[PDB]
Design a protein around this ligand. Sequence first.
Ligand code: NA
Length: 16
Amino acid sequence: FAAAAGLXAPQXPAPF
Ligand code: NA
């Protein structure tokens, strides 16, 4: 779970 958040996180801005 922790890993999931951290690996996803830098892509969160892509649409914004
Ligand atoms: Na990115």
